[PDB]
Design a protein around this motif. Structure first.
Motif, PDB file in Angstrom:
ATOM      1  N   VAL A  98       0.852  -1.230   0.000  1.00 36.42           N
ATOM      2  CA  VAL A  98       0.000   0.000   0.000  1.00 36.42           C
ATOM      3  C   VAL A  98       0.874   1.263   0.000  1.00 36.42           C
ATOM      4  O   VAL A  98       1.924   1.304   0.610  1.00 36.42           O
ATOM      5  CB  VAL A  98      -0.822  -0.094   1.283  1.00 36.42           C
ATOM      6  N   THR A  99       0.461   2.277  -0.715  1.00 35.70           N
ATOM      7  CA  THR A  99       1.278   3.526  -0.801  1.00 35.70           C
ATOM      8  C   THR A  99       0.490   4.710  -0.235  1.00 35.70           C
ATOM      9  O   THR A  99      -0.712   4.802  -0.405  1.00 35.70           O
ATOM     10  CB  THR A  99       1.538   3.727  -2.293  1.00 35.70           C
ATOM     11  N   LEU A 100       1.147   5.600   0.463  1.00 33.26           N
ATOM     12  CA  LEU A 100       0.414   6.751   1.071  1.00 33.26           C
ATOM     13  C   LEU A 100       1.223   8.043   0.931  1.00 33.26           C
ATOM     14  O   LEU A 100       2.358   8.035   0.497  1.00 33.26           O
ATOM     15  CB  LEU A 100       0.236   6.392   2.550  1.00 33.26           C
ATOM     16  N   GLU A 131      -7.313   2.485  -0.493  1.00 35.74           N
ATOM     17  CA  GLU A 131      -6.650   3.566  -1.272  1.00 35.74           C
ATOM     18  C   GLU A 131      -7.518   4.827  -1.280  1.00 35.74           C
ATOM     19  O   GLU A 131      -8.732   4.760  -1.279  1.00 35.74           O
ATOM     20  CB  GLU A 131      -6.478   2.994  -2.686  1.00 35.74           C
ATOM     21  N   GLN A 132      -6.895   5.973  -1.293  1.00 37.14           N
ATOM     22  CA  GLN A 132      -7.652   7.259  -1.311  1.00 37.14           C
ATOM     23  C   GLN A 132      -8.273   7.538   0.059  1.00 37.14           C
ATOM     24  O   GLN A 132      -8.841   8.586   0.288  1.00 37.14           O
ATOM     25  CB  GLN A 132      -8.735   7.091  -2.383  1.00 37.14           C
ATOM     26  N   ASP A 133      -8.077   6.660   1.002  1.00 35.53           N
ATOM     27  CA  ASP A 133      -8.558   6.951   2.388  1.00 35.53           C
ATOM     28  C   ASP A 133      -7.714   8.064   3.012  1.00 35.53           C
ATOM     29  O   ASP A 133      -6.826   8.609   2.387  1.00 35.53           O
ATOM     30  CB  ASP A 133      -8.412   5.647   3.178  1.00 35.53           C
ATOM     31  N   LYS A 151      -2.364  10.474   3.366  1.00 37.55           N
ATOM     32  CA  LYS A 151      -3.341  10.367   2.246  1.00 37.55           C
ATOM     33  C   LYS A 151      -3.005   9.142   1.388  1.00 37.55           C
ATOM     34  O   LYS A 151      -2.069   9.155   0.613  1.00 37.55           O
ATOM     35  CB  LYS A 151      -3.149  11.658   1.446  1.00 37.55           C
ATOM     36  N   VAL A 152      -3.731   8.069   1.555  1.00 40.09           N
ATOM     37  CA  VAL A 152      -3.415   6.829   0.785  1.00 40.09           C
ATOM     38  C   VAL A 152      -3.923   6.959  -0.650  1.00 40.09           C
ATOM     39  O   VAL A 152      -4.984   7.499  -0.892  1.00 40.09           O
ATOM     40  CB  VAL A 152      -4.143   5.700   1.517  1.00 40.09           C
ATOM     41  N   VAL A 153      -3.159   6.515  -1.609  1.00 41.99           N
ATOM     42  CA  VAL A 153      -3.594   6.673  -3.024  1.00 41.99           C
ATOM     43  C   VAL A 153      -3.497   5.345  -3.783  1.00 41.99           C
ATOM     44  O   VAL A 153      -4.139   5.163  -4.799  1.00 41.99           O
ATOM     45  CB  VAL A 153      -2.640   7.712  -3.616  1.00 41.99           C
ATOM     46  N   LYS A 154      -2.696   4.421  -3.325  1.00 43.67           N
ATOM     47  CA  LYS A 154      -2.577   3.135  -4.068  1.00 43.67           C
ATOM     48  C   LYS A 154      -2.504   1.952  -3.103  1.00 43.67           C
ATOM     49  O   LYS A 154      -1.652   1.889  -2.242  1.00 43.67           O
ATOM     50  CB  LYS A 154      -1.285   3.252  -4.877  1.00 43.67           C
ATOM     51  N   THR A 155      -3.317   0.959  -3.330  1.00 39.30           N
ATOM     52  CA  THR A 155      -3.218  -0.291  -2.528  1.00 39.30           C
ATOM     53  C   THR A 155      -3.190  -1.492  -3.470  1.00 39.30           C
ATOM     54  O   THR A 155      -3.459  -1.372  -4.648  1.00 39.30           O
ATOM     55  CB  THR A 155      -4.478  -0.310  -1.662  1.00 39.30           C
ATOM     56  N   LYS A 159      -9.066  -2.657  -3.986  1.00 34.13           N
ATOM     57  CA  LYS A 159      -9.682  -1.402  -3.464  1.00 34.13           C
ATOM     58  C   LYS A 159     -10.725  -1.740  -2.397  1.00 34.13           C
ATOM     59  O   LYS A 159     -11.543  -0.918  -2.031  1.00 34.13           O
ATOM     60  CB  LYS A 159     -10.349  -0.751  -4.676  1.00 34.13           C
TER      61      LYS A 159
END
Length: 185
Positions: A98-100, A131-133, A151-155, A159
């Motif tokens: 996961v990326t944030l 993601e996006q959470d 700010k998470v953008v990619k998991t 999703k």
């Protein structure tokens, strides 16, 4: 077959601290209208997608179409009190990557690099990720800083709400809140 869906109800919240942004207190009908059992995984979506878990409403009759959440959970999607959000019931899984993106500026104190991916995994380990959470930090800060949230953008999962584990992979980018201004103030 799977028949996975949710319901549209009204966001709830009171001046009281009402801690617990990952817990959703609902009534028997809001929980049982689909399948939600005690402590199942529930996803919420008013303006954006968010995750959380199912809880029993104190008043098992007023929570037949309202969800009481913490300010951060409401801030996660961008909705206000009494708005209308859709909650879909789902289950958890072990996210593998996961990326944030921590939102800060010259007042960025929560950045270190080197082992920071583990530092994020350690703090967020065994937690539901979407993601996006968005996430927040305890009552901590410094000068007059603003944002200071994750700010998470990619998991890696689909999703859907997943739980992080010590084995999950994480990514931290160095792009602060540049050209980014989520509604909220």
């Amino acid at each position: 077959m799977e028949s996975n869906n949710g319901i549209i109800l009204r966001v709830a919240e009171a001046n009281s601290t009402d801690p617990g942004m990952s817990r959703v207190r609902l009534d028997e009908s809001s929980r049982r209208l689909l399948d939600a059992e005690i402590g199942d995984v529930v996803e919420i979506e008013k303006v954006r997608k968010t995750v959380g878990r199912v809880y029993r409403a104190r008043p098992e009759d007023e929570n037949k179409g309202i969800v009481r959440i913490d300010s951060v959970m409401r801030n996660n999607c961008g909705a206000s009190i009494g708005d209308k959000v859709k909650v879909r019931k789902v289950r958890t899984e072990i996210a593998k990557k996961v990326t944030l993106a921590p939102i800060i500026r010259k007042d960025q104190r929560l950045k270190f690099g080197e082992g920071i991916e583990e530092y994020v995994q350690r703090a967020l380990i065994r937690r539901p990720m979407l993601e996006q959470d968005n996430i927040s930090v305890p009552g901590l800060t410094l000068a007059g800083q603003t944002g200071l949230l994750f700010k998470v953008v990619k998991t890696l999962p689909s999703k859907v709400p997943v739980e992080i584990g010590e084995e999950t992979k994480i990514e931290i980018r160095e792009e602060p809140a540049s050209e980014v201004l989520e509604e909220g103030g």
